[PDB]
Amino acid sequence: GMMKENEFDLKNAWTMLSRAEYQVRRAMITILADKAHVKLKFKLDSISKGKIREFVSKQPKADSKWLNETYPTFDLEKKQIIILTTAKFIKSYTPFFEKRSKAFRYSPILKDALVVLDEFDSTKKQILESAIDEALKIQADLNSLFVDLSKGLNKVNEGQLPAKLGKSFTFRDAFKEILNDAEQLTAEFKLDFLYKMEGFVMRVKPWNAYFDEELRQVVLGRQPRNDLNFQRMLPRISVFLKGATKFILNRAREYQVSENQKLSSLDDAMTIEDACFSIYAALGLSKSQAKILFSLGHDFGRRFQQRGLSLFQFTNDPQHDLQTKINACFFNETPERYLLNLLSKANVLGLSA
Amino acid sequence: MQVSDFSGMIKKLQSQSPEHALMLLNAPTGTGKSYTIIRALCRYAIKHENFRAFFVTDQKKNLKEQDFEVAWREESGAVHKAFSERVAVVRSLEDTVNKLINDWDRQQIPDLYRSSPIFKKSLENLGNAFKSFGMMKENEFDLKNAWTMLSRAEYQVRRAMITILADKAHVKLKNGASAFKLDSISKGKIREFVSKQPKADSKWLNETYPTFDLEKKQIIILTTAKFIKSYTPFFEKRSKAFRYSPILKDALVVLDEFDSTKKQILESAIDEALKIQADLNSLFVDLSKGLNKVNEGQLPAKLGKSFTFRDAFKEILNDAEQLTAEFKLDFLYKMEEQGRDSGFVMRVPQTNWVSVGKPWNYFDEELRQVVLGRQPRNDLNFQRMLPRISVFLKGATKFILNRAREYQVSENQKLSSLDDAMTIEDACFSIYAALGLSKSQAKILFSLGHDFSSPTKVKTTYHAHSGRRFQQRGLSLFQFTNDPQHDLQTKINACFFNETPERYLLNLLSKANVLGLSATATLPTVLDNYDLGYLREMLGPRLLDGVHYLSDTTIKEFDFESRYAKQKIEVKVETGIVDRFFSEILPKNNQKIDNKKIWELDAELAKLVNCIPASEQSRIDKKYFARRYLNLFNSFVIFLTDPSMTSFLGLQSLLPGADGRMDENYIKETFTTLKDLVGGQDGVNTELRIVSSRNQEGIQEQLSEALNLVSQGGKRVYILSAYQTIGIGQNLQHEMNEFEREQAANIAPKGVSKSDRRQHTIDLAGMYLGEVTHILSSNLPFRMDAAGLRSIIEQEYLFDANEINIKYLNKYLKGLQHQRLERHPEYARSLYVSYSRTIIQALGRMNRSFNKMPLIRLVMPVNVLQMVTDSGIDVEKTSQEYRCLLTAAKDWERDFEKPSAEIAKQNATFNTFRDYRFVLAYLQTSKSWAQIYHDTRWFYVRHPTVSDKDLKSSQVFQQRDDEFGLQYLLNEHLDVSYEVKPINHDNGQFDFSGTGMEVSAEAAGLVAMCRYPGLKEAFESLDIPTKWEPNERILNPAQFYNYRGLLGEVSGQFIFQNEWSLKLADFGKPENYELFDFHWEGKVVIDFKNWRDAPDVDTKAERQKVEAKLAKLQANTQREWRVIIINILASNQTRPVMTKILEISGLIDHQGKFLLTPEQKLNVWRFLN
Amino acid sequence: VTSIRGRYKKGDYLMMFRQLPAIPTIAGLELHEILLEDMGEFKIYPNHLLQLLLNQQSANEKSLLEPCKTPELLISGEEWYREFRDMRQQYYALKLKVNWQQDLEMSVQTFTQVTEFQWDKQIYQFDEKRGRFQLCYQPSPGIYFVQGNHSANRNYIDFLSLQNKSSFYKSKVGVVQLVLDNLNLNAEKYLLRPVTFHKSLVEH
Amino acid sequence: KQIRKQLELNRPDKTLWRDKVVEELGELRPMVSGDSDYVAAYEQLQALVTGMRPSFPLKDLDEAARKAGLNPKRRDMRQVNQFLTENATFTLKTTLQRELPDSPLAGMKWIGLTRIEEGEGHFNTFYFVGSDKSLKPVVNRAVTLRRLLPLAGDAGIIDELFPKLAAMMSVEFVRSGQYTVVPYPVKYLREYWYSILRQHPEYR
DNA sequence: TTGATACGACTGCCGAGATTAGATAAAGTG
DNA sequence: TGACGGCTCTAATCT
DNA sequence: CACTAATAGATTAGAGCCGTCACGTATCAA
């Protein structure tokens, strides 16, 4: 309250309040665990969680009422009607036992659900505003991100990987075609060699790029020698990344369903953000690169609704002077595609007027 | 104490520019050395106009900005520049914001900025941010974020002022934000514009921002924490680091309170080491791929050409390529089981310690994964792989650092804009990013070699050798964590620690002269002061001394012994020996005390020690607190029963609090009761004043109020506090009263000015010295946090200084495993030196006036008397009362020399064993290591006993640049024979006091070797001596093992190639060249084994080893090989036994004759052919 | 305060007052000052007086007669203390009582932690200074306790230990000796002969 | 009381004065007068004391003696420890677990019979059972007193049957590794009654 | 040259203070 | 269903 | 935005617990 009176960035105070609330949340678990026939104080997220939920379903009469009214997320799978505002519907929720907040759009809870959209006309501006902040917040270098993905993709073909994930990949032939496409265009555009500099570039006075062997790099200063139409270099890499990310999303879905099926449990595992992030972390990619790849991937007609906007911006830094980071901002999730994805996970209603 | 001495010292330090020597000066605190050095530094800076100086202290109040300005005003020539222009203080961000806001409140801001609306808005935003930062500090903390907010607001304010400055200077700033990269020339226009401005606004701007023109600054005053940290340029958004800044070149950093800086440097290094963590597997794979990327001609021209120019690059490539195959690091590690406690694996330079339970361990092809689990099955050796990866990473980082410096100097000589260029943190980061690593990977791989190197190629007459291992390899500890984010692999979080405070000081000494000032600068302790032995070893002539540049009169005045003796100021010490009762802390001569009051006092004491806050099963022994309370109350009684005890200063290490450990109210009630009980007519007017941070008033305010109560009040006071509260300085002197003027002693020498303040005041008449608190961090449990790292680093420091053997280290590590603290080391000179340093600093504040009480009294517990020492510190350069205390501590002594020598011997043997184990692990991989091993063993054999000079002058010692196995023992009596008792023969532990194993030529069989005809001529041919000439250095048992091995090798080669008349060709193929000794006709293998004592335990283990080596050899050569092991000497009957392994009990007896010629010849000839 | 209670009930509590207060009149209570020569009228045998003197004692070595209101002497220190996963502080004391046939009973009493006052149940508060539990008649600052031990593991106090004096003092025999020596010292006047355990001769 | 007195003598952190201890041992020297090894060990300890600092905890003296070879298990050092316990103000080891003619641990170690007055002329008879082995540093449980009440016959029934009961009580099968508090045929009766209870739920 | 009987079975230490810069990082409405 | 045996919590009994 | 209300003890009697069934070492008899 004092912080709110201060008119300040609510991030620090929100984190402190979240810690304070997590303390009492954990207190509830440590009270319930020894009460029920369990202990071990993830609190056995496959076994003793079920024991806790069963214990709080048969002995309590009024305490269960308070627990359900206060903390609905304690046992969400058995909850029937989920009334919530759109902002919380798109800004994730904090599970009872776990500390990290799982996202609504990916939770197995939303599987085969019926989502009534009251004031559905207003679920457009919120989605667009959240998407634009998400796109602006997460940035990565296109050149490093592409080459890192190809090395991880080449890792699959050449054995390696835990096999559990390896099979699915060797099957479904297109895995080899994306790889030979990558290897083919890597030689064409020399992304193996580090770019060099000496304004935004929107997509739906120009720059060129040779390959001075002496320098063993490529220049991009304007004196047109061997312009391979770098302006066409950008879209080829973009579309390859899109296709590879869709393929990785499909493999992540397969690995998700497999992992959840062998680990029979109480509807709580592998929220398919974890699946894709695990796939990318096994492939040798950074956290930010994994985030960008998943954002590009989650896409499974006009020009905007087909490929969207892709703005690029060069930069330079004394911290890294021998290379130039081609920073890429990507936007492909228009609100219509968000509605379509929510339409794949569940089905919507139209109470708007 | 004269300014000329300090000026000459500065001149001498500046005269050693090509070498950057280090200066240490130890003088008592009561001389005002800071003021004198300020005056001298200011005079020199004013005179030379090209000289830089960094006055670096610990605490803000010791900066003495006003002293600097008054000295500048006093000695600022006759044509002068503004003090704010030349000498400026680099404050921290908070302090800068605080000063800016305070100036805004009292309107010190010039009209140029205050009239700006945009700057007014920015400053209002800054004030709003600070009013929160303040509250954040005072509240929820996690202040890292807060700080980022404050830095952003301050940068916005700086942007506003630079914008208006450019607007008024006719400079156009080219413009999701404007690129505020003002051209070097625009910076020049701004600087000359503020120069042309009136003096007031330019003075304010220079005072509030020293970074505006830092190149023109000459003397920079800043705290140690800020100096080791970074700073923000006035124009540049990000922050440059002082350590890498070009401004440090040919500078003179002055470290006031030199010894106290090590604690701050070490804590900062620990915090930064823990802040940076990375996944070992990923980091290694990405670095290896980058190292393959350079060696395919894919990198730009500059890096690729320089990288391939050296063979070390190819060696590192081969190392990585074979390491990947050895430990299968192309795959992923997945600790499938959910460990009840994942724990951490710490790799000290002594052992690979695991936090809990069985050490982690196999490749699993059918599942195509590495398990990394706690099961007996382990193929790929993990505990080997973690050190193996760490060493390769360190080497690769050192190589990359060298190439980065080459590239930096290249680009710097290329560019013409000198003012702002690549400063070597930038070059390393650029190279790492060019390889393809992320920012976190770049940081973790740059914090490994950091900057320490051989300075390209600079030959110097000195050789920097050091046997200490913690300061060369450091400690690295790893953590295993698995998260639902990455279910496939398990992240091995690795955090390293290499930059010790001594290493940081040495790196600083590579670019700037360092002058150190402290009362105890040269105290030989490795806990609070720098490792003086390590610095001396690595510097040599660069470690100069300060006493050579002081007047003899100052040294004579430092004595104070003759004055005290002449005026009959006797110092008497009283020891306190109490067990549990009050009866022995009260005067026995009197009897007026009724036993009922004593019984009540004991009952309240028992209740208070029962009130002790529950610990985590540490088990409150109501006894220690009772002892401390009784010692304090004995001090109270002694203070009350002496009318001449005008002023008194009790010094515990606990500030009294609300709990029962030290209870302020209980202490006050006990003091009042004891006054009423035993005072009678002597302490009818006494008073106790507790000074602490608990009280709202400042420490100086409370001390002044108590001393005023003494002086004008007329009553005697007792001051009680902690050692850490009353800092060095903070003089406790009070104006003399009528009674105190009636009896005193004016120590002032004849001829002093009668009107002098120091002659008009008095010092304390008595101090009570309580027990000293934590010297070696006592903390449980050993988590992976700052406290645990500090404790283990303290233990490693003690081990390197040769003060604790491996036995104590292993015991302490096992104690950490079970969360049970162990006993402090009994014989550790650093511990007692730190104890005496604290007590000396406490006593140094009683000799700051010319007048003295005729009887100074000192009271302390027995353990304080026991823990004090005299080693290392000159007696003449300390307070006279400390001399009396030392004289009265002659009974309570603990000898250091003999146990310290024994521990040094054991540590030398253990380090030699560890070096040989390490080189054995790396034996077949590298070629340089094999050459070093061979040369070292042959020097071992050629020089069983060597002199110090003859050892240093050797080529192996010269080329190794560190003690690798060449750490001989210290032969004190020049003995040719010494006997030791082995303990855990597989860990290099040897108790040198106990007998049971001989290390001599006779023990190695060299005399029996001599009794064989023809071996003498071969030995003299190979320069191998036939007997051990007496010398001042001798081999250690770990060295003796390889001595025996090579002696047996050569003797067996000669004997077998002479008796059998066949040539044994040594294995000339590298990998098998260090695997087996000799071969012949490509089908037999000969491996002689000289071992005399030879514990017969588990010979089948030796069979398994030799068969495994034979199988590896056969797999290498695809041929049938037969091994013939031979013992050169045997005290048992000869008896060959076959199996392809052949066996021979012995070849020559103690008479040097063949044992069983017919049968042995028949069997060997039959099987071999 | 001790408890006179017998099968032939003529009283229910005995109050030892240094200065007798104004005796009030409350329905359902009969309060009347008595004399020790008429102490036989209420079946007050010479054993509740030793119980009063015992109730005045303390576990600490070298203690005195401190006034107390708890009818029973319950001795517990910091060693006999443990916490649960709910951080429920659970001490266990050593109840000392002299029965009607002049035998000392050293039964172990276990106390559990309750947050709020219970007006219907007995509430106990640990007097840390005197190292013994005390009855709580009104809400008081501190942490309240109630009799009972519902956790799985029991609580046993060692009879006697000879490891060292400190360990000896934390056993039944050691605590009894501490209390007996204290009582024999501070209440020297009140007993004609000291409190000692009855000596007997072994026959076979 | 005697256990407290002896453990005070053997207290580890008990500070001692080198001069005082040396003088006390010198004055106690004439009283030793034992065999060769006993007096030799006493003189060795006497000469050892002078080595340490003027003041020291008793643990330092104990460790110095142990290092010098004065292991308390030895026959010579045990007599020195007993002599110090009986006559000196300190002792390195206490003679508590030792079997002595009048031990403070009497009644906790053997089987015997007692005759408690329990008032006037009733002459109540009891017996106890103790652990045959030497007592361990800690003893978890006390040893209860059974009662011997002659239902029929004169008072000599106890005096003539108790040796037989004690003989029956010295058996190993009834109680593992200890004496049995009651005669062994009680075990037979208990097993036989349990066998009946297995078939007759009316008595369970 | 071994089969008894009387006694050993060892736990460490014991705070205050002062100086820095450090990307981040959510989802709110009475 | 190792079993003996002290003894501890706790339900029972008793106003 | 909200609570007020206003509450057997003391002493035995028994089921069921833990925990102790002693162990490695100097040492006199036979």
CSV table of N, CA, C and O in Angstrom, one decimal, chain B residues 705-760:
chain,number,residue,atom,x,y,z
B,705,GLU,N,30.0,12.5,25.0
B,705,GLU,CA,29.1,12.8,26.2
B,705,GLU,C,29.6,12.1,27.4
B,705,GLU,O,29.7,12.6,28.5
B,706,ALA,N,30.1,10.8,27.3
B,706,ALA,CA,30.7,10.1,28.4
B,706,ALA,C,32.0,10.8,28.9
B,706,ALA,O,32.2,11.0,30.1
B,707,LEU,N,32.8,11.2,28.0
B,707,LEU,CA,34.1,11.9,28.4
B,707,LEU,C,33.8,13.2,29.0
B,707,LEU,O,34.5,13.7,29.9
B,708,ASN,N,32.7,13.9,28.6
B,708,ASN,CA,32.3,15.1,29.2
B,708,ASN,C,31.8,14.9,30.6
B,708,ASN,O,32.1,15.6,31.5
B,709,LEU,N,31.0,13.8,30.8
B,709,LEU,CA,30.6,13.4,32.1
B,709,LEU,C,31.8,13.1,33.0
B,709,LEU,O,31.8,13.4,34.2
B,710,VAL,N,32.9,12.6,32.5
B,710,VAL,CA,34.1,12.5,33.3
B,710,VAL,C,34.8,13.8,33.6
B,710,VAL,O,35.1,14.1,34.7
B,711,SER,N,34.9,14.7,32.6
B,711,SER,CA,35.7,15.9,32.7
B,711,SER,C,35.0,17.0,33.5
B,711,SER,O,35.5,17.4,34.6
B,712,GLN,N,33.9,17.4,33.0
B,712,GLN,CA,33.2,18.5,33.8
B,712,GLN,C,32.2,17.9,34.8
B,712,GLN,O,31.9,18.6,35.8
B,713,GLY,N,31.7,16.7,34.6
B,713,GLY,CA,30.8,16.1,35.6
B,713,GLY,C,31.5,15.8,36.9
B,713,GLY,O,31.0,16.1,38.0
B,714,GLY,N,32.7,15.3,36.8
B,714,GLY,CA,33.5,15.0,38.0
B,714,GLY,C,33.5,13.5,38.4
B,714,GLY,O,34.2,13.2,39.4
B,715,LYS,N,32.7,12.7,37.7
B,715,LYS,CA,32.6,11.3,38.1
B,715,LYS,C,33.3,10.4,37.0
B,715,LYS,O,33.4,10.7,35.9
B,716,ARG,N,33.7,9.3,37.5
B,716,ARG,CA,34.4,8.3,36.7
B,716,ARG,C,33.4,7.5,36.0
B,716,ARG,O,32.3,7.1,36.5
B,717,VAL,N,33.6,7.2,34.7
B,717,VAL,CA,32.7,6.5,33.8
B,717,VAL,C,33.3,5.1,33.4
B,717,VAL,O,34.5,5.0,33.5
B,718,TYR,N,32.5,4.2,33.0
B,718,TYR,CA,32.9,3.0,32.4
B,718,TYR,C,32.2,2.9,31.0
B,718,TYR,O,31.0,2.9,30.9
B,719,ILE,N,33.1,2.8,30.0
B,719,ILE,CA,32.6,2.7,28.6
B,719,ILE,C,32.7,1.2,28.1
B,719,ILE,O,33.8,0.6,28.2
B,720,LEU,N,31.6,0.7,27.6
B,720,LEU,CA,31.6,-0.7,27.1
B,720,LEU,C,31.1,-0.7,25.7
B,720,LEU,O,30.1,0.0,25.3
B,721,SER,N,31.8,-1.4,24.8
B,721,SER,CA,31.4,-1.5,23.4
B,721,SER,C,32.1,-2.7,22.8
B,721,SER,O,32.6,-3.6,23.5
B,722,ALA,N,32.0,-2.8,21.5
B,722,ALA,CA,32.6,-3.9,20.8
B,722,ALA,C,33.8,-3.5,20.0
B,722,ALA,O,34.0,-2.3,19.8
B,723,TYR,N,34.7,-4.4,19.6
B,723,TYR,CA,35.9,-4.1,18.8
B,723,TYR,C,35.5,-3.4,17.5
B,723,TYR,O,36.2,-2.5,17.1
B,724,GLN,N,34.5,-3.9,16.8
B,724,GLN,CA,34.1,-3.4,15.5
B,724,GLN,C,33.5,-2.0,15.6
B,724,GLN,O,33.5,-1.3,14.6
B,725,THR,N,32.9,-1.6,16.7
B,725,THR,CA,32.3,-0.3,16.8
B,725,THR,C,33.3,0.8,16.9
B,725,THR,O,33.3,1.7,16.1
B,726,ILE,N,34.2,0.7,17.9
B,726,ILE,CA,35.3,1.7,18.0
B,726,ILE,C,36.3,1.5,16.9
B,726,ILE,O,37.2,0.6,17.1
B,727,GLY,N,36.3,2.2,15.8
B,727,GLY,CA,37.2,2.0,14.7
B,727,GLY,C,38.6,2.5,15.0
B,727,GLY,O,38.8,3.2,16.0
B,728,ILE,N,39.5,2.1,14.2
B,728,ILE,CA,40.9,2.6,14.3
B,728,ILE,C,40.9,4.1,14.2
B,728,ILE,O,40.3,4.7,13.2
B,729,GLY,N,41.5,4.8,15.1
B,729,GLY,CA,41.3,6.2,15.3
B,729,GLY,C,40.3,6.4,16.4
B,729,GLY,O,40.3,5.7,17.4
B,730,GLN,N,39.3,7.3,16.2
B,730,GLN,CA,38.2,7.5,17.2
B,730,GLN,C,38.8,7.7,18.6
B,730,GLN,O,38.4,7.1,19.5
B,731,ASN,N,39.8,8.6,18.7
B,731,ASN,CA,40.6,8.7,19.9
B,731,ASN,C,39.7,9.1,21.1
B,731,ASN,O,38.8,9.9,21.0
B,732,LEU,N,39.9,8.4,22.2
B,732,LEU,CA,39.1,8.6,23.5
B,732,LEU,C,40.0,9.4,24.4
B,732,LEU,O,40.7,8.8,25.3
B,733,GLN,N,40.0,10.7,24.3
B,733,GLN,CA,40.7,11.6,25.2
B,733,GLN,C,39.8,12.7,25.7
B,733,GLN,O,38.9,13.2,25.0
B,734,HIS,N,40.0,13.0,27.0
B,734,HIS,CA,39.1,14.0,27.7
B,734,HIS,C,39.9,15.0,28.4
B,734,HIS,O,41.0,14.8,28.8
B,735,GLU,N,39.3,16.2,28.5
B,735,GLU,CA,39.9,17.3,29.2
B,735,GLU,C,40.1,17.0,30.7
B,735,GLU,O,39.2,16.4,31.3
B,736,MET,N,41.3,17.4,31.2
B,736,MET,CA,41.7,17.0,32.5
B,736,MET,C,40.9,17.7,33.6
B,736,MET,O,40.7,18.9,33.5
B,737,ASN,N,40.5,17.0,34.6
B,737,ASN,CA,39.8,17.6,35.7
B,737,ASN,C,40.7,17.9,36.9
B,737,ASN,O,41.9,17.7,36.8
B,738,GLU,N,40.1,18.3,38.0
B,738,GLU,CA,40.9,18.8,39.1
B,738,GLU,C,41.6,17.6,39.8
B,738,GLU,O,42.9,17.7,40.1
B,739,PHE,N,40.9,16.6,40.2
B,739,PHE,CA,41.5,15.4,40.8
B,739,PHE,C,42.5,14.8,39.8
B,739,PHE,O,43.6,14.4,40.3
B,740,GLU,N,42.2,14.7,38.6
B,740,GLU,CA,43.1,14.1,37.6
B,740,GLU,C,44.3,14.9,37.3
B,740,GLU,O,45.4,14.4,37.0
B,741,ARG,N,44.1,16.3,37.5
B,741,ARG,CA,45.3,17.2,37.4
B,741,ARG,C,46.1,17.1,38.7
B,741,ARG,O,47.3,17.4,38.7
B,742,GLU,N,45.5,16.6,39.8
B,742,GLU,CA,46.3,16.5,41.0
B,742,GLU,C,47.3,15.4,41.0
B,742,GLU,O,48.4,15.5,41.6
B,743,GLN,N,47.0,14.3,40.2
B,743,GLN,CA,47.9,13.2,40.1
B,743,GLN,C,47.9,12.7,38.6
B,743,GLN,O,46.9,12.2,38.2
B,744,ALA,N,49.0,12.9,37.9
B,744,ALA,CA,49.1,12.5,36.6
B,744,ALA,C,50.6,12.5,36.2
B,744,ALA,O,51.5,12.8,37.1
B,745,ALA,N,50.9,12.2,35.0
B,745,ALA,CA,52.3,12.2,34.5
B,745,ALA,C,52.4,12.7,33.1
B,745,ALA,O,51.8,12.1,32.1
B,746,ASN,N,53.0,13.9,32.9
B,746,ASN,CA,53.1,14.6,31.6
B,746,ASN,C,54.2,14.0,30.8
B,746,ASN,O,55.4,14.4,31.0
B,747,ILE,N,54.0,13.1,29.9
B,747,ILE,CA,55.0,12.4,29.1
B,747,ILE,C,55.6,13.3,28.1
B,747,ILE,O,56.5,12.9,27.4
B,748,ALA,N,55.1,14.5,27.9
B,748,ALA,CA,55.6,15.4,26.9
B,748,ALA,C,57.1,15.7,27.1
B,748,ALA,O,57.6,16.0,28.2
B,749,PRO,N,57.9,15.6,26.0
B,749,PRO,CA,59.3,15.9,26.1
B,749,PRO,C,59.5,17.4,26.3
B,749,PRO,O,58.7,18.2,26.0
B,750,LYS,N,60.7,17.7,26.9
B,750,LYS,CA,61.0,19.1,27.1
B,750,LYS,C,61.1,19.9,25.8
B,750,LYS,O,61.7,19.4,24.8
B,751,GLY,N,60.6,21.1,25.9
B,751,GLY,CA,60.6,22.0,24.7
B,751,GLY,C,59.3,22.0,23.9
B,751,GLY,O,59.2,22.8,22.9
B,752,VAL,N,58.2,21.3,24.3
B,752,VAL,CA,57.0,21.3,23.6
B,752,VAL,C,56.3,22.7,23.9
B,752,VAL,O,56.5,23.3,25.0
B,753,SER,N,55.4,23.1,23.1
B,753,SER,CA,54.6,24.3,23.3
B,753,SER,C,53.7,24.1,24.5
B,753,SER,O,52.9,23.1,24.5
B,754,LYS,N,53.7,25.0,25.4
B,754,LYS,CA,52.8,24.9,26.6
B,754,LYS,C,51.4,25.0,26.2
B,754,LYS,O,50.5,24.3,26.8
B,755,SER,N,51.0,25.8,25.2
B,755,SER,CA,49.7,25.9,24.7
B,755,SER,C,49.5,24.9,23.6
B,755,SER,O,49.7,25.2,22.4
B,756,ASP,N,49.2,23.7,23.9
B,756,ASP,CA,49.0,22.6,23.0
B,756,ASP,C,47.9,21.7,23.5
B,756,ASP,O,47.9,21.3,24.7
B,757,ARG,N,47.0,21.3,22.6
B,757,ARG,CA,45.8,20.6,23.0
B,757,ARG,C,46.2,19.2,23.5
B,757,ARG,O,45.7,18.7,24.5
B,758,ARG,N,47.2,18.5,22.8
B,758,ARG,CA,47.6,17.2,23.2
B,758,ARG,C,48.2,17.2,24.6
B,758,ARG,O,48.2,16.1,25.2
B,759,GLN,N,48.7,18.3,25.1
B,759,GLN,CA,49.2,18.4,26.4
B,759,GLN,C,48.2,18.8,27.4
B,759,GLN,O,48.4,18.6,28.6
B,760,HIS,N,47.0,19.2,27.0
B,760,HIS,CA,45.9,19.6,27.8
B,760,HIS,C,44.8,18.5,28.0
B,760,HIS,O,43.8,18.8,28.6
